[PDB]
Amino acid sequence: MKLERVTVKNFRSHSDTVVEFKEGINLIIGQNGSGKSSLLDAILVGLYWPLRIKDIKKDEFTKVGARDTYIDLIFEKDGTKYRITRRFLKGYSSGEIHAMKRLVGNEWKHVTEPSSKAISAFMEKLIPYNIFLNAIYIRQGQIDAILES
Amino acid sequence: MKLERVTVKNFRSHSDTVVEFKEGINLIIGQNGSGKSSLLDAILVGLYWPLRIKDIKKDEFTKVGARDTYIDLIFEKDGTKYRITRRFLKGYSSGEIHAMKRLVGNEWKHVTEPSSKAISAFMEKLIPYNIFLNAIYIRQGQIDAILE
Amino acid sequence: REAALSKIGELASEIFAEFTEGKYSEVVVRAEENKVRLFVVWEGKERPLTFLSGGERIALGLAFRLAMSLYLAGEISLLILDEPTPYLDEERRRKLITIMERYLKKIPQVILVSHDEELKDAADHVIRISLENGSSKVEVVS
Amino acid sequence: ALAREAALSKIGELASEIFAEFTEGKYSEVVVRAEENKVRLFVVWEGKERPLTFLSGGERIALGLAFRLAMSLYLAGEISLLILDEPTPYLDEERRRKLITIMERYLKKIPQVILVSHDEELKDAADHVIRISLENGSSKVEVVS
């Protein structure tokens, strides 16, 4: 798996951010309270939502003054370029966006049914949640967790 | 409560250490692996042994290459000057030594029977192990524990 | 525990406010039956602890600890902290030093352990510990 | 059961190398054992295996990073990505430097790695550097290196 770009809107301290990750070592220096972990958790949210992390709840990650939360992720896995779009709204599904696509030329095409259910199942087969959590994304405060048994 | 002097022999990296604590902010600067937490945990063992903390074991804390672990703690509490002394003998638990005394005049006198159970019972009444670990000695990595 | 935390709250707020440059005006200690809830006031509204960043959490933890030791400065009088600077950036570390000269100094006795030299400034007594040949060596400075 | 023994054993040889380096040989080897699905870790010190409690707090973070790197190195073709949030806590000045070294020595063998930190010192061992600041209630990303 390789991340290309992350677009987040109204996620914690993020109102509208766009990050383009490259190959090699990508550092993001920031001070306490700046947005570092916020960006990473959005990436997690947009990939496996719904999650099983008690310390990450929908009604809490929507930027204070905002109403909708937007996360757009474009990544590459085994030659195929995928893209997942999540749009959170506290009111209706009509506006809610949950679609994972496959790039065909210059056009993105539904990899499957646009819903948390279908996208979850497809992501689980593309890259299992557990493997992402103790092998890929090491959250803040969890560096030596791997030593625990 | 106020700590006065701690003498530690053969506890993890400590061979023969003696520290004198004073009023105000007493700082101990050291590098990773230099002996800081070891000294602090020695104080905890000296005050409340037997502790039921999984990462502090009698069989494990004896300094490698030695047999005699000795901890002598001098501290004040409500005007009285106390002193706890403990000795562990690797390989011979029958050799342990536990004693707690108070400064009467200029002569340390047993405040209770010299044993773990007796000392412990007296410490739990002079300052409960529970309050010690929750409001007094914040172990490494435990600073936000109170938030949970 | 309910009655306990509902005493140090004002002090914790005070300290946490200066630790975060007013970013968080207050710390609320509410009750929820057999389980206390702590909130932080951000932009005038109460926010749950998840609201904070990792470094901010460590700061709130230090604030409570100092508030606690302060409230008990008479009956207990001692606080022992092992490595208070993890997760703090350069700025929060400088603020910590101010919080030491201001609150930590109000406690009869404090034993602080750290790899951070920078803390030497707000200390009354300094002792150096190093590993000299498989064994710990102690040197008194201040 | 034995295929996991092969994986683990391999990751341990990798962790041992990085950790010996990270600690200037203070700990010469990291051991990984398996007595019925129960994985135990030991660090070799002065010739013998020592349980993990033997370690200091900073050392335990260094060993943790060693297993994360080793882990990502062993899956570098199947996963190719490692994201570390704040890798420096508990590490003293020297171990922080040493870490940098461990970075463009091992961290550069993984296709893609996303680091996050408040330590500007890691600004060297990076390929691309991005700053994030909190301007007026919202985060602002500025591209640098």
Ligand SMILES: Nc1ncnc2c1ncn2[C@@H]1O[C@H](COP(=O)(O)OP(=O)(O)OP(=O)(O)O)[C@@H](O)[C@H]1O
């Ligand atoms: N719902 C929200 N709306 C707006 N801002 C928020 C929201 N939730 C959290 N924040 C802000 O985001 C910050 C925490 O973000 P984050 O965890 O990304 O920081 P960080 O860069 O990782 O810092 P550290 O070095 O402390 O880890 C807090 O300082 C907080 O004020």
Ligand SMILES: Nc1ncnc2c1ncn2[C@@H]1O[C@H](COP(=O)(O)OP(=O)(O)OP(=O)(O)O)[C@@H](O)[C@H]1O
């Ligand atoms: N039984 C033992 N015999 C000899 N040396 C030991 C023993 N147990 C632990 N050590 C050594 O003591 C060190 C850990 O001590 P301690 O936890 O006191 O360090 P520290 O000064 O707190 O460092 P840090 O900044 O990493 O927290 C380890 O580096 C280890 O090598």
Ligand SMILES: [Mg+2]
């Ligand atoms: Mg963070």
Ligand SMILES: [Mg+2]
């Ligand atoms: Mg320590």
